Amino acid sequence: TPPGVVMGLAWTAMGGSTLFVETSLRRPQDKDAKGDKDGSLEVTGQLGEV
Amino acid sequence: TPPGVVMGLAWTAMGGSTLFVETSLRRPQDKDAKGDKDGSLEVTGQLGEV
Amino acid sequence: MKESARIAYTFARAFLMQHAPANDYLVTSHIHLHVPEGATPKDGPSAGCTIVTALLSLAMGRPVRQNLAMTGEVSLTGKILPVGGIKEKTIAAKRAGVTC
Numbered sequence: 649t650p651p652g653v654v655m656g657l658a659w660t661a662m663g664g665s666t667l668f669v670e671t672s673l674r675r676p677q678d679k680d681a682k683g684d685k686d687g688s689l690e691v692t693g694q695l696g697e698v
Numbered sequence: 699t700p701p702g703v704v705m706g707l708a709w710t711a712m713g714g715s716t717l718f719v720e721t722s723l724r725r726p727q728d729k730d731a732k733g734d735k736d737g738s739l740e741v742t743g744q745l746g747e748v
Numbered sequence: 749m750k751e752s753a754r755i756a757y758t759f760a761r762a763f764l765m766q767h768a769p770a771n772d773y774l775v776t777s778h779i780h781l782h783v784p785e786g787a788t789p790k791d792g793p794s795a796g797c798t799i800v801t802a803l804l805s806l807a808m809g810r811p812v813r814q815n816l817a818m819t820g821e822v823s824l825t826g827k828i829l830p831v832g833g834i835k836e837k838t839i840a841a842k843r844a845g846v847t848c
Contacts, residue, residue: 674736675736679734680734694747694748699825702825703825720823720824720825721824722758722759722762722824722825723762724758724761724762725761725775726765726772726775740754740758742751742754742755743751744751
């Protein structure tokens with residue numbers, strides 16, 4: 649389980665299942681020590697709106 | 699072709715098949731080396747959402 | 749058609765920097781393009797190659813050579829592909845005065 653991944657139970661249509669969840673950087677972080685812009689999240693994985 | 703393709707097997711509706719994925723540059727790369735506006739993809743091929 | 753148009757545009761913008769680097773008319777220029785409807789929809793990609801030369805003509809300023817029709821599909825690296833229904837195409841273009 650390298651950092652930024654965690655187990656997560658889920659109650660799918662037929663029984664439970666132990667699907668993982670994962671996250672990662674998208675661009676190198678220190679583009680600017682002085683920068684000020686939202687570090688916007690980008691969700692992925694066939695998300696429902698809720 | 700050396701830059702930008704790789705043969706890709708795929709399980710088409712009838713038999714297998716050998717589709718090529720192809721990618722290319724879209725604009726001169728270095729108009730401003732010091733800037734920070736990440737290069738968007740544009741995907742094609744009539745992909746479904748998944 | 750939108751798909752084929754986009755890929756053709758990208759190939760055009762790529763070929764020009766590959767060939768004539770100093771020109772940049774196409775990298776920065778809003779450009780309307782008009783492809784009249786009438787091609788059978790399954791055959792609709794077949795016209796793709798023509799666009800890629802159309803744009804190039806405008807990007808260099810030379811009018812095309814006289815009465816020289818062409819067709820065929822293109823790929824992002826420029827490997828042209830076979831297109832069907834050649835017979836109807838030949839018989840129709842023959843009487844338009846096309847020669848090459």
